[PDB]
């Protein structure tokens, strides 16, 4: 009961880090909406964790910023004032910045940086002054703090989500408007998409990469986002809050 | 039951942040021994919470380096294997660098510095390769992570904590020793000794200092340090974990 | 001398800040080339400083994605190879995140963030294995490090600049390009800009904001990008340098 | 000529870093007293500068909290108003916090941390209110930002340092003492001492550890102090500079 009445929409919560989310706020008592681009993926999704009396997945692309008012509107019909918003939605290009093309810059950003503006400026606008304890959670990641060369414009999307959802918490707490926004900064997890990539967990698990000497799995990423969309943490906006096993740590 | 099975030291446990964090350890199933510098306010404080099967007072000053073995040996003595080590004695002084006397100086650093070293070190020793799911957590500051011109050394003290934490959170990663080490940084939080200080309150809410216009109160700490202790964190080490209305992040 | 030989490109070097970066480069050795919007500010700004055989205006959007090759060309006929690329074209936006509309996002990010990526990928593709000592000094802010409610796409290009200019950082070091890559952040500096908005400069001198009393001046900046230019900084990659009186201190 | 008028005191100023410090102070036109703990190394090294119009040994340990005003009255005998202190005197010990001797940590902390409180707290009196742009540079790490597994206590004391530097800052800027502090965070730089260690510069230079693949030299730290030492970084106070070859940068 830790999420006793909070409704949460979870973007691209289909798959991975997004799906134990939803499925710890489904455990938590929360009423949750997932996202994701591909009906048959949400659908499974969805069941896999519960009824529609707690669970329901809308077919959205976080880019897509007129569907982002039908997605709340959708949320409120079923399970009234949405309380958390997720936004974890997004994609990854494996280039430099050297390497980048401006089509690959422009479709990441739209996903990773204009995706979570679109869901962080609506959360505020629907849930503020309503005493919903509400809560919005930005997924930064441990690229939202060190390099990767090979990582150029997820860093430019992950440090941009630092930095803009601090400037949403301070205006939200100044206000009093009863919403905070926080950020949450996963090292390597593993799941379906690092299985299928020959050789990455085991680049991830080395030392020099994560100290634990072996990468997380997505309910670890979930339990610090029931923490942060709880009245527990009523007290923390503005924060970075990071799971990595000890990545950004050395 | 989120602390089913655990064993906790809750140095300075006695009153404020420490009394409470001890609280709800008890109340997700852990067991605890709380120490502080007086009997009267530490036995109190335990009978507080609950019957000796959950909790007990034990003196104890965390500069008092011969007493921390003894400390260990009372707590596995009543409650089985330590598991759980939260650093958390301490003091303040309230004088800008260029006005701190060597003696207020040394004075503070041997609670907050060696205090947190002498815990930090034999929870190690006495909690590794145990498969305890071993968790110490240090108690920094948001004085950790930001200067303030009237409290000099206890900055040195916090920022001292935090990057000290990093070094033993890396080598009980990297050993597998199956121990983490996090630090909280609070900001302000209510606590009878603020309420004596006139106009402290007041101060410390200015939207300038934090955003959320108020303070916080001690179980705003307890329950980031519950996610810390159990085993929903297990990925996380070497990490900062701020819960501080807003101060840090403007 | 300390710039003895450098060839510069300083975007936004019309006013203010880049202005006197290319005040102090040409007093330092190095050819310029100031980029700017307008072309009476940007001729009389190059003429200021001094003669085409060390400063030129050429008038360019930073985030017009195809005059960037052409400026390299242009810096390149009248100077020979650049080695020094300054990205300090900006604009601001005076909007809380809630109330930004998506104009002004896209507005804004296509200038900050866009046009610092078109020009760190191609500072790195024409300067590197040339044995320039290039170097790359990204203007980000102190809103790259701590939020303002009412600087929301702000943070966010400043957040991105801070974070992509690590990863470029990385993977010049990794490769042995002969290209370092920094972050500059500056506090409040005085300008004409600044003076035109009545009250600006003594709510950035309140002592909440910048604890010096008072704000900067573009010279203060100049001289930590001449240190950045030069061989001196030649150990410096993948950092960031603060000159703002204090404000992310406290 | 950029150091014009400065009087220096560099602690530990006879090897290594603070010697090219030293160097590079009286180049741009300091008057400098080094000091270190060994006359024979001392004497050497100021004469291989300068003669003693510009440059004297003091024979002095950080640690030795009464020799502190006796060495600023040395340096104004010699030299006129101290307007610089370089806290750069430092020891390491290789050892994890699990296996730090009390007599260990004690006697680093009293060197890195005592000392550097002695310097700082006397600089800010004896400096303070004198119209001498004053400037205190304290010597931090990359162990002020990230964790060592084998450098439990030097972690604790550049955590330290990195943010007790912060306060006095602050209170510098706050009271209008004409004084700036700030620190320095060195990467790797070879020196005689790591030569002595056979295998410590390939372990440094390894692209996990320094992205450059190859460690500084004591200049590239002398610039930096330059910079903070001369009147170019008014604005700068409260604030770290990394020169680390890109290691913290992932």
Redesign the interface.
């Known amino acids: 009961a830790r999420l006793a009445g909070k409704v949460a929409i979870v973007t691209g919560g289909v798959n991975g880090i997004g799906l134990a989310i939803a499925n710890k706020f489904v455990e938590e008592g929360a009423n949750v909406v997932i996202t994701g681009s591909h009906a048959l993926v949400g659908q499974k999704a969805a069941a896999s964790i519960g009824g529609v009396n707690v669970i329901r997945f809308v077919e959205h692309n976080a880019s897509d910023?007129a569907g982002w008012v039908a997605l709340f509107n959708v949320t409120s019909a079923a399970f009234g004032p949405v309380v958390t918003v997720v936004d974890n939605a997004g994609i990854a290009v494996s280039k430099?910045?050297?390497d980048?093309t401006?089509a690959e810059?422009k479709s990441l950003?739209v996903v990773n940086?204009?995706g979570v503006?679109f869901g962080?400026?609506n959360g505020?606008?629907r849930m503020?002054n309503k005493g919903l304890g509400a809560s919005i959670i930005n997924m930064s990641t441990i690229?939202?703090?060190?390099?990767?060369?090979?990582?150029?414009?997820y860093?430019?999307?992950?440090?941009?989500?630092?930095?803009?959802?601090?400037?949403?918490?301070?205006?939200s707490?100044?206000k009093?408007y009863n919403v905070r926004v926080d950020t949450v900064h996963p090292?390597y997890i593993k799941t379906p998409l690092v299985d299928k990539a020959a050789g990455a967990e085991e680049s991830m698990s080395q030392?020099?990469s994560v100290?634990?000497?072996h990468i997380?799995?997505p309910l670890?990423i979930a339990?610090?986002s029931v923490?942060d969309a709880?009245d527990?943490?009523?007290?923390?906006?503005?924060?970075?809050?990071?799971?990595?096993?000890?990545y950004?740590?050395?």
Chains 1, 2, 3, 4 share one sequence.
């Open positions: 910023e430099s910045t050297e980048v401006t810059w950003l940086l204009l503006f962080t400026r505020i606008e503020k690229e939202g703090f060190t390099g990767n060369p090979v990582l150029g414009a860093l430019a999307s992950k440090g941009a989500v630092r930095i803009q959802s601090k400037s949403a918490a301070l205006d707490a100044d009093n090292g030392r020099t100290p634990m000497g997380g799995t670890d339990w610090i923490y709880t527990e943490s009523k007290f923390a906006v503005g924060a970075k809050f990071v799971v990595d096993g000890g950004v740590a050395e």
